[PDB]
Design a protein around this ligand. Structure first.
Ligand SMILES: CCCCC/C=C\C/C=C\C/C=C\C/C=C\CCCC(=O)O[C@H](COC(=O)CCCCCCCCCCCCCCCCC)COP(=O)(O)O[C@@H]1[C@H](O)[C@@H](O)[C@H](OP(=O)(O)O)[C@@H](O)[C@H]1O
Ligand SMILES: *[C@@H]1O[C@H](CO)[C@@H](O[C@@H]2O[C@H](CO)[C@@H](O[C@@H]3O[C@H](CO)[C@@H](O)[C@H](O[C@@H]4O[C@H](CO)[C@@H](O)[C@H](O)[C@@H]4O)[C@@H]3O)[C@H](O)[C@H]2NC(C)=O)[C@H](O)[C@H]1NC(C)=O
Ligand SMILES: *[C@@H]1O[C@H](CO)[C@@H](O[C@@H]2O[C@H](CO)[C@@H](O)[C@H](O)[C@H]2NC(C)=O)[C@H](O)[C@H]1NC(C)=O
Ligand SMILES: *[C@@H]1O[C@H](CO)[C@@H](O)[C@H](O)[C@H]1NC(C)=O
Ligand SMILES: [Mg+2]
Lengths: 339, 1108
């Protein structure tokens, strides 16, 4: 009665199939992946060179600029790509205000209109956003708006949770080290070029807006973080407590990027197209560079189907379609010349 | 000394003797868990991960979650424990079949033999054992059915002996045969202790205030079965584990296999890579913390010391890289080796129908040495032979007669001597015809088959007769003889009869005298009295003793029969000469006194009776010679030829004598003709020394070819084996044994069948199998690597403690070639894959620390790395492990030379293990470096200008690194069943459905707080789907082409077989084998007298008086 059954699974005679690596089978698979990849590996380079950007490195603007009039930026600070050729190099000057706060105006000429939407990012280099003491170091509860007391705070915001028995309100190394540099909302058009209004609405992630609510703290218990004292010198007042639900540029800072070089969104304009001409940008130089030792910048790219001028996806489809078409000919040589 | 009170159920339990409870399971229930920790800590991986989870519990150090690596340890802890409980159940009920077996037991309350199992047999009970029933424990007989209270036990489990021994009860207690008059037993049993000496025993039993001495003659043992006797009356002495047979054999030890001895030298080669990749990265954290102290002000680093932040980041890189060792390796190597042992024990070509016994794999860890066997240490009786002799042919007057004639052999023309065969009924035609010359010889021959022996017949309920023989050779002489006519029936104390069935009359034969068989005599003779009054002498014996006693001028067939005895033993048959002489009435009268003058004497009788026979057997004439053959089991000569083509060297280790293990070796084609032996059977150690020195010297001086290596064999015996197993000549014994084809060892004790195994285990590096049955070689099964048992109808104490239990010998071909060389390739990929899946992913943590300033941020989420071993990539180790046949079952048995792949270990070594680790680096430096050229600033997505964060990039590394590791498993597998499509391209569809459920549902419940919106920002993005297309294909172009280039331009030996599957010193020449299974103490001469079979059965059972 212990006789095992005669099922086709138990006797390991299951209905099976075998891979025959044979040069009438593998060789028409090397042309299956060298004639569907090259029309994609070309179809992406044609959509990563139709992206028109303009990179201005405004990093050392306080040192090497005259307050008097414009000059040219050195070539080692500007990268730019367009359909047509530029007629003048862009221009730039430093402007110190009456209070003693600087400002770095930038003037550039755009050689043709761009029908798509226009985005403004600021590129930061050598800023280790993905450090282990930096990504996890912010409190989750205070972003949602729960009035957390001191003892039930997170230990992840460990150096800056409290200064004088007080709740540092957006605790964490992320919110303490926020990029201050405001960007002027309008590309002001010079030499009778029409000015261009950019907005900062909807620049964050759409799921960050549901998570970033205003705070239910009482204002007598919360101090600013120690790198926000030039904006709130007295402390957090009851009237201008920051509404982080509508503070968009704080939301795109807490979405921590993955490399020491990254873009961050700060401005966009969807409904219209800017025309050809010379324009002007105004940036206040609040964030120093000796804090991290890198280069803050300013880019004006247009969003393509795979991103900016990023030839890496078009090229990685062609090193495959190269090696899957090179060894599609070393088959027919090593077969025929040496069977 | 141990004392036993007869007729007492209470007081005998006070001395604390053991019970019949045997335990074949490697532990019991009570010692489960603290023995289990040594089992978990002997693996070096599970030893390592307990320390790592303790290291995770110092605060603020873990880059992952704080409980992830104790969370994937308790799964590994539990699943390797639930395997152990079902390997406890399966070895509980299989042990229960011996515990539940029946035994008639005296109970004083009932005063009758009642039905109870074997368990409740206390030491001191009185039991009763019927015919053909195994004795439950070591006992002392009291009285029995046979006259003078004797019996016959078959010791085929106690040793390799084929014959039956006489165990006569003492004459004082011969009267107590009544179950009603049993109730007056009064006395003690003063015995010896458990001694584990089989053939020696002492003890003194007192009864009714009168002592009785005992002997090993009055003792029968545990594994022996009772044969040719109605019942016996036993008083149990030992039991359980304290028997004389089962005390030295322990429980099933932990046998570390030959793959796990390479894993623990592979993991040490991975702690090197783990320690180097801490002291490359964590040294770099010391450098960048001090060299960039100006530019890291936003982190608020302490900078207290160079040895505090070293050790605060020695553990972070310890924890992040501790998944380089795969924790799901030592469970998915248990649950493949358990699910392979369930697939072996369900094959119909490994299932014996006649007994209805499927094969069963008890120890399921030793499944992969079945592809690396290099020696086989068999057993002769029970394993090779079927323990059944039948009469094959006979030769008289130079004419041979056989029932079925082979087609190569026929009575041809003589070349000076007539050879060939005839049918048996033609022997009757020369017998019935009174004109022929040989008719007095045939009549003097066919009664010599029927009279001269010592078999005792017993009628059945049917008129068919059943012959009860002391030695099973002459039990085949009569039964084969009665087919020729002259059927032997009723035996009397003075005479025998014989019924000529063609005439129907029965001729009396007054047995006058009969001599017994001995070791050095090699013959036995029986002097008879015919019904005519002309008395007669008969004789049967060996060639080298019968040739020195002739009347040379009388017989002329002597050269004709010696040619036939070189013919018979060449085919593998046990031969026997048959010669007589005519004796007058006066020449008996002078000698029969002199025989009786050697009979009235007491103390020189053992050395004077054999002298007393030599005066009368001087002048003999020759009738002819017969040849009984031993039934080898089915498929034995076809298996051993296949097992020697695969390079395995068969070693036979019997318990039998030397003269018949050679004859078995001739019939199974281990031996052959034109193959000289190297026999070493010498007395003292110096006589083994010279004969060891002479054999090595005679063949190391000259090179002998491999054709001349097959022409040599070794035969040694156990008296000469203990002098070649002392540690000064063990090296010599290999050097003669490493050149000969087959090695036979004879009369080998139960200990020395392990001390040969424990000698070749510690002299070479080759694995070796042991196969057998019965408890004489239960010590051999615990000493070899794979110990196969053969489950017999009696005994099978070997099949208890064996790792694999099989039905018979002929399944060893399919087990070792098909199911052995599969189970070595099927685990040597599902381990080299499970070392590779945890390196194509968990290296992108290490190639990340060249970014992020040597800190240790985990590139992926904490739980999604702990779902990698357990959910998505645990199935392709299973399907590769159990459902992948690299060459099919028809082709491995067709070409037995393919087993030399598994012997040398061409599938699993460190020099091929490093080819899978380095292939796990290069597969991780493409899913990383291919995904920093894409997502160069986070600017990859086209969703209204938003960007990809740290967590919508880590998923693109994880999802690409799953669809490479699954895509590699689709290239290393060989055969695509319906169970491969479920695992390898189906676990991809598992992850691409389980992840959007994990990204929308589980973050809301405060677990896996990140990727709160990534499923929008990966799956909807056009870059995530064009990364999954080419980043696998870029990293499998190396695999898809070197697999192609290996099949054609540098093919191995099995690839052309895979392509075949889809489309298509004594010399043996002058040796005349003598093998008579009778030995001394078969009670040869006492047993002929005190019998009858015409006297009807007694009242109380089968009581028969001694009618002598
Ligand atoms: C860090 C400290 C630790 C250092 C440790 C390093 C080295 C250890 C020291 C010595 C190593 C010792 C020996 C290593 C040398 C040789 C190994 C023996 C050769 C060897 O058989 O392996 C091969 C790997 O082939 C590579 O070679 C694999 C080729 C890939 C090599 C590319 C090198 C990448 C190096 C890392 C790149 C880093 C990039 C930079 C990233 C950092 C960014 C800053 C095995 O795979 P295989 O596909 O052929 O397997 C085959 C095949 O799969 C199958 O089709 C065949 O069976 P079937 O036909 O029946 O199906 C059968 O032939 C089977 O064998
Ligand atoms: C743009 O973002 C910049 C970095 O986030 C930030 O620059 C830092 O600003 C803080 C605050 O203004 C500076 O901290 C100062 O530290 C110096 C000593 O090094 C002090 O003058 C003073 O510390 C004082 O400390 C006392 C006890 O510790 C405390 O009681 C006082 O209240 C007082 O805080 C300043 O706090 C820091 O040096 C700046 N540079 C760097 C490289 O960190 C800018 O403020 C910010 N700008 C705007 C407009 O937001
Ligand atoms: C995007 O840019 C266009 C300019 O090309 C903006 O359109 C102008 O919006 C301002 C708002 O103050 C009006 O005063 C102008 O008359 C508009 N120009 C035209 C030609 O209609 C548009 O509003 C911008 N989108 C935003 C800010 O969301
Ligand atoms: C458009 O640009 C002008 C020029 O600075 C500015 O005054 C006006 O407020 C802008 N409109 C909006 C809606 O911001
Ligand atoms: Mg045996």
């Amino acid at each position: 009665s212990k006789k095992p059954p005669n099922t086709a699974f138990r006797q390991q005679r299951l209905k099976a199939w075998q891979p025959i690596l044979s040069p009438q089978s593998v060789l028409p698979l090397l042309i299956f992946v060298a004639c569907i990849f090259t029309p994609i590996g070309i179809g992406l380079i044609v959509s990563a060179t139709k992206v028109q950007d303009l990179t201005i490195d405004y990093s050392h603007c306080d040192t090497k600029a005259s307050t008097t009039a414009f000059e040219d930026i050195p070539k080692k600070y500007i990268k730019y790509h367009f359909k047509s050729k530029v007629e003048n190099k862009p221009q730039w000057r430093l402007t110190e205000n009456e209070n003693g706060e600087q400002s770095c105006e930038l003037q550039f000429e755009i050689p043709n209109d761009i029908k798509k939407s226009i985005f403004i990012y600021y590129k930061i280099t050598n800023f280790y956003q993905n450090h282990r003491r930096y990504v996890q170091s912010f409190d989750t509860k205070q972003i949602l708006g729960e009035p957390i007391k001191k003892d039930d705070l997170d230990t992840s915001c460990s150096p800056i949770r409290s200064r004088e028995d007080k709740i540092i309100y957006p605790c964490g190394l992320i919110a303490n080290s926020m990029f201050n540099d405001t960007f002027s909302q309008v590309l002001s058009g010079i030499d009778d070029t029409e000015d261009y209004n950019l907005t900062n609405k909807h620049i964050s992630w759409s799921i960050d807006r549901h998570r970033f609510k205003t705070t239910k703290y009482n204002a007598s218990d919360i101090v600013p973080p120690p790198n926000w004292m030039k904006k709130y010198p007295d402390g957090y007042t009851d009237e201008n407590l920051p509404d982080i639900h509508t503070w968009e540029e704080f939301q795109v800072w807490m979405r921590t990027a993955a490399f020491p070089k990254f873009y961050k969104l700060t401005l966009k304009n969807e409904s219209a197209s800017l025309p050809k001409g010379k324009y002007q940008m105004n940036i206040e130089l609040n964030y120093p560079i000796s804090l991290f030792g890198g280069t803050k910048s300013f880019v004006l790219t247009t969003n393509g189907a795979i991103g900016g001028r990023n030839m890496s996806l078009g090229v990685l489809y062609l090193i495959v379609a190269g090696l899957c078409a090179l060894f599609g000919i070393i088959f027919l040589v090593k077969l025929i010349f040496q069977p | 000394p141990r004392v036993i009170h007869i007729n007492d159920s209470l007081a005998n339990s006070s001395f604390g003797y053991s019970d019949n409870h045997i335990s074949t399971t490697k532990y019991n229930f009570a010692t489960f868990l603290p023995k289990f920790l040594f089992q978990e800590f002997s693996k070096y991986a599970n030893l390592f991960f307990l320390c790592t989870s303790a290291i995770q519990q110092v605060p603020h150090v873990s880059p992952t979650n704080r409980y992830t690596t104790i969370g994937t340890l308790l799964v590994v802890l539990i699943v390797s424990a639930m395997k152990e409980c079902i390997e406890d159940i399966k070895r509980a009920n299989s042990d229960k079949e011996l515990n539940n077996s029946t035994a008639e037991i005296f109970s004083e309350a009932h005063d009758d033999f009642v039905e109870k199992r074997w368990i409740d047999i206390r030491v001191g009970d009185i039991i009763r054992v019927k015919s053909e029933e195994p004795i439950p424990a070591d006992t002392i007989i009291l009285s029995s059915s046979e006259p003078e209270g004797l019996c016959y036990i078959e010791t085929a489990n106690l040793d390799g002996e084929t014959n039956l021994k006489i165990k006569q009860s003492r004459v004082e207690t011969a009267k107590f045969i009544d179950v009603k008059t049993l109730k007056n037993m009064n006395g003690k049993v003063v015995s010896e202790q458990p001694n584990s000496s089989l053939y020696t025993y002492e003890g003194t039993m007192t009864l009714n205030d009168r002592q009785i001495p005992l002997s090993p003659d009055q003792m029968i043992l545990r594994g022996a079965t009772l044969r040719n006797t109605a019942w016996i009356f036993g008083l149990v002495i030992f039991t359980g584990h304290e028997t004389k047979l089962l005390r030295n054999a322990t429980a099933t030890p932990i046998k570390r296999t030959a793959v796990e001895k390479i894993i623990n030298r592979q993991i040490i080669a991975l702690f090197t890579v783990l320690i180097v990749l801490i002291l490359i990265s964590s040294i770099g954290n010391v450098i960048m913390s001090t060299a960039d102290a100006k530019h890291l002000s936003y982190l608020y680093l302490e900078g207290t010391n160079k040895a505090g932040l070293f050790f605060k980041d020695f553990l972070t890189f310890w924890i992040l890289f501790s998944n380089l060792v795969p924790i799901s390796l030592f469970v998915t190597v248990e649950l493949i080796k358990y699910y392979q042992a369930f697939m072996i024990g369900s094959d119909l070509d490994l299932y014996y129908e006649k007994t209805d016994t499927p094969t069963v794999v008890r120890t399921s860890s030793l499944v992969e040495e079945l592809g690396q066997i290099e020696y086989i240490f068999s057993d002769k009786t029970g394993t090779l032979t079927r323990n059944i002799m039948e009469f094959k042919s006979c030769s008289i007057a130079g004419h041979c007669y056989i029932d079925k004639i082979p087609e190569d052999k026929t009575a041809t023309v003589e070349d000076g001597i007539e050879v060939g065969y005839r049918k048996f009924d033609d022997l009757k035609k020369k017998l019935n015809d009174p004109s022929d010359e040989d008719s007095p010889i045939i009549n003097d021959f066919l009664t010599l088959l029927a009279t001269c022996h010592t078999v005792i017949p017993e009628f059945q309920s049917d008129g068919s007769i059943k012959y009860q023989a002391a030695s099973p050779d002459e039990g085949a002489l009569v039964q084969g003889g009665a087919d020729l006519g002259y059927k032997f029936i009723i035996r009397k104390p003075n005479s025998v009869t014989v019924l000529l069935e063609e005439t129907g009359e029965e001729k009396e034969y007054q047995l006058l005298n009969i001599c017994e068989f001995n070791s050095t005599r090699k013959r036995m003779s029986a002097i008879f009295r015919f019904p005519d009054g002309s008395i007669k002498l008969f004789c049967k014996g060996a060639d080298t003793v019968i040739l020195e006693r002739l009347d040379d001028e009388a017989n002329q067939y002597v050269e004709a029969t010696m040619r036939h005895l070189e013919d018979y033993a060449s085919e593998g048959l046990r031969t026997l000469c048959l010669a007589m002489r005519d004796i007058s009435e006066g020449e008996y009268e002078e000698w029969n006194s002199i025989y009786n003058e050697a009979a009235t004497t007491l103390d020189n009788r053992a050395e004077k009776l054999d002298e007393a026979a030599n005066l009368i057997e001087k002048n003999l004439i020759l009738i002819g010679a017969t040849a009984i053959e031993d039934k080898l089991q089915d498929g034995v000569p076809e298996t051993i030829h296949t097992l020697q083509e695969a390079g395995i060297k068969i070693w036979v280790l019997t318990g039998d004598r030397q003269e018949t293990a050679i004859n078995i070796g001739m019939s199974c084609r281990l031996l052959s003709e034109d193959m000289n032996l190297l026999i070493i059977n010498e007395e003292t150690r110096d006589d083994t020394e010279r004969n060891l020195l002479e054999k090595i010297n005679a063949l190391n001086e000259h090179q002998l070819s491999t054709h001349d290596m097959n022409t040599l064999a070794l035969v040694i015996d156990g008296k000469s084996l203990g002098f070649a197993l002392e540690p000064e000549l063990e090296d010599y014994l290999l050097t003669v044994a490493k050149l000969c084809k087959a090695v036979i060892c004879c009369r080998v004790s139960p200990l020395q069948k392990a001390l040969v195994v424990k000698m070749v285990k510690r002299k070479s590096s080759s694995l070796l199998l042991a196969i057998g049955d019965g408890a004489n070689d239960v010590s051999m099964i615990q000493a070899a690597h794979v110990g196969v048992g053969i489950s017999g109808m009696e005994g099978m104490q070997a099949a208890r403690s064996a790792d694999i239990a099989v039905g018979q010998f002929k399944f060893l071909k399919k087990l070792l070639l098909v199911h052995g060389s599969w189970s070595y390739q099927r685990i040597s990929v599902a381990i080299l894959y499970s070392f590779y899946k945890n390196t194509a992913l968990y290296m992108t943590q290490f190639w990340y620390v060249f970014a992020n300033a040597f800190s240790g941020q985990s590139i992926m989420e904490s739980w999604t790395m702990s779902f990698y071993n357990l959910f998505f990539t645990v199935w392709p180790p299973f399907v590769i492990g159990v459902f992948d046949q690299f060459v099919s079952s028809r082709l491995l048995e067709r070409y037995p030379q393919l087993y030399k792949l598994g012997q040398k270990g061409q599938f699993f070594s460190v020099y091929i293990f490093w080819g899978w680790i380095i292939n796990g680096f290069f597969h991780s430096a493409i899913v990383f470096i291919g995904t920093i050229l894409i997502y160069r600033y986070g600017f990859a997505l086209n969703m209204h200008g938003e960007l990809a964060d740290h967590w919508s990039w880590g998923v693109t590394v994880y999802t690409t690194s799953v669809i490479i590791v699954l895509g590699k498993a689709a290239l290393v597998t060989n055969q695509w069943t319906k169970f491969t499509l479920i695992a390898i391209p189906g676990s991809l569809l598992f992850w691409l459905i389980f992840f959007p459920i994990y990204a929308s549902i589980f973050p809301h419940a405060n677990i896996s707080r990140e990727y709160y919106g990534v499923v929008k920002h990966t799956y909807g993005s056009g870059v995530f789907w064009l990364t999954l297309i080419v980043l696998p294909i870029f990293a499998l172009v190396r695999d898809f082409l070197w697999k192609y280039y290996k099949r054609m331009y540098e093919p191995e030996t099995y690839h052309v077989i895979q392509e075949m599957q889809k489309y298509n010193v004594q010399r043996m020449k002058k040796q005349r084998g003598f093998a008579f299974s009778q030995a001394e103490e078969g009670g040869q001469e006492k047993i002929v007298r005190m019998y009858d079979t015409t006297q009807k059965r007694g009242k109380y059972g089968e009581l028969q008086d001694a009618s002598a």
